[PDB]
Symmetry: D2
Subunit: 23 residues, 4 copies
Amino acid sequence: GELKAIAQELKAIAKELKAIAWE
Amino acid sequence: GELKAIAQELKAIAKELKAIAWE
Amino acid sequence: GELKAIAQELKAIAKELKAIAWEEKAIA
Amino acid sequence: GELKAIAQELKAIAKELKAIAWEEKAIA
Ligand SMILES: [N+]
Ligand SMILES: [N+]
Ligand SMILES: [N+]
Ligand SMILES: [N+]
């Protein structure tokens, strides 16, 4: 449900932050 | 670096939120 | 600008999680 | 209580990300 969709949002954000770390 | 450690924090949180969804 | 937008998104999620928690509490 | 603590953690991370962004900006 909602909490799973938010969890997926947080994992998407984790990938953005890693991409920012390395750019 | 910092942003990777924060990304790992967000992935840990995503797993907590999924566990909360299903309990 | 990118990190600042992600920061707003996390604050928005925090508010959403408190709304979810409150609704669960209310219902039970 | 668990979702409320996670919400505080996300708000804390948001502040940390703005501090990181600002330091990068300052330095450049
Ligand atoms: N949920
Ligand atoms: N970093
Ligand atoms: N945002
Ligand atoms: N917390």
